[PDB]
Design a protein around this nucleic acid. Structure first.
Ligand SMILES: O=c1ccn([C@H]2C[C@H](O)[C@@H](COP(=O)(O)NP(=O)(O)OP(=O)(O)O)O2)c(=O)[nH]1
Ligand SMILES: [Cl-]
Ligand SMILES: [Cl-]
Ligand SMILES: [Cl-]
Ligand SMILES: [Mn+2]
Ligand SMILES: [Mn+2]
Ligand SMILES: [Mn+2]
Ligand SMILES: [Mn+2]
Ligand code: NA
Ligand code: NA
Length: 326
DNA sequence: CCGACAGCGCATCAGC
DNA sequence: GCTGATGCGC
DNA sequence: GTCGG
């Protein structure tokens, strides 16, 4: 809002760098500048003012000066005039179409959704599904729908085997009023880091959710990670619910609560607890928390039976998920 | 001046 | 066939 | 593109 013009500009530049230039570090640099500016509680008056913020450097400061002086950016104006770059950038909005497939499509004269529809035989399965649900995938999920999805997923999982444990993580678990997708973590007492005790633990769950027509499509599935599409059941001549993105991860239970911590997030809170965690000489990844030795050497992973256990190790107060914004 | 900027599972392709 | 690289989205 | 070593 306050510097929306600037941050829109930076976001536009980030998408260009990612999708057209294929320069993911520049993408992230621009994102990082836009994010720090978005949190700044003043109307930016000059580039030099902005350069004081971490993540804003000499070149963005110059771009901000030009934008403040003229109401636009020549670089971006020129990018908007480039139909080919605009098409490449647009196509990467299809899930499964990255910067490289987008460029390849456009070089073959495939430039719009309509072109994709008439060239399906050139899309892989992921891309076909991304195309099929192009609009739905960009829509957000209201919390009320998430609650319903949680209730379906948690109970259907237990019907396959009462000993399964599933947890809906991500922004939902942080109490967010809307979510972009559904992140499910799954475990079972038979699955531990050392051994596979049961076959097809993830496959049977996915099968069950297909059976009750909650899961409608699959982007990818292996022995530990499922990515696909789901949809709430529609009551009588009610409008259809949008198709939603769902991810299910099968985690060994001896690593389960480290996973839950990681995939609960947020983004900026994980680093805070990590960078911190080095305090007391502990290192934290998504699977484990290990002690750091006097020489810098990570020890064996400590036992974790709950999320609180992780907190008891680096000795901080258990933080409720709602409080993990940063 | 320089390389880091996360690293992984899965699908697909490259190169034998 | 095989193995390793790359593209992609987390 | 920006940062830190
Ligand atoms: O590449 C990743 C993947 C996951 N994570 C973490 C933190 C995060 O909050 C969580 C879920 O990843 P999402 O992409 O689903 N973001 P989130 O669920 O928090 O918000 P959204 O409603 O937009 O999905 O796991 C990362 O930090 N980086
Ligand atoms: Cl880059
Ligand atoms: Cl502009
Ligand atoms: Cl580990
Ligand atoms: Mn999520
Ligand atoms: Mn997600
Ligand atoms: Mn081949
Ligand atoms: Mn510097
Ligand atoms: Na700065
Ligand atoms: Na895409």
């Amino acid at each position: 809002t306050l510097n929306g013009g600037i941050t829109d500009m930076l976001t536009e530049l980030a998408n260009f760098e990612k999708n057209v230039s294929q320069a993911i570090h520049k993408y992230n640099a621009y994102r990082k500048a836009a994010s720090v500016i978005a949190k700044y509680p003043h109307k930016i008056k000059s580039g030099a003012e902005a350069k004081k913020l971490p993540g804003v450097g000499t070149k963005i400061a110059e771009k901000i000066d030009e934008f403040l002086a003229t109401g636009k950016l020549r670089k971006l104006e020129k990018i908007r005039q480039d139909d080919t770059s605009s098409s490449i950038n647009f196509l990467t909005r299809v899930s499964g179409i990255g910067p490289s497939a987008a460029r390849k499509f456009v070089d073959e004269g495939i430039k719009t959704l309509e072109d994709l529809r008439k060239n399906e035989d050139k899309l892989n399965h992921h891309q076909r599904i991304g195309l099929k649900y192009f609009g739905d995938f960009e829509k957000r999920i209201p919390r009320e729908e998430m609650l319903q999805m949680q209730d379906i997923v948690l109970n259907e999982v237990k019907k396959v085997d009462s000993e399964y444990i599933a947890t809906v993580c991500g922004s939902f678990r942080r109490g967010a009023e809307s979510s972009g997708d559904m992140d499910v973590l799954l475990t079972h007492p038979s699955f531990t880091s050392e051994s596979t005790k049961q076959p097809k633990l993830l496959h049977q769950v996915v099968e069950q959710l297909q059976k009750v027509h909650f899961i409608t499509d699959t982007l990818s599935k292996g022995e530990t990670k499922f990515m696909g599409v789901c949809q709430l059941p529609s009551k009588n001549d009610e409008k259809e619910y949008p198709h939603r993105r769902i991810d299910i991860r099968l985690i060994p239970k001896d690593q389960y609560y480290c996973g839950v911590l990681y995939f609960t997030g947020s983004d900026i809170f994980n680093k805070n607890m990590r960078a911190h965690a080095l305090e007391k000489g502990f290192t934290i990844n998504k699977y484990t928390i290990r002690p750091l030795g006097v020489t810098g050497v990570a020890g064996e992973p400590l036992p974790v039976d709950s999320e609180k256990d992780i907190f008891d190790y680096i000795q901080w107060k258990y933080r409720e998920p709602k409080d993990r914004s940063e």
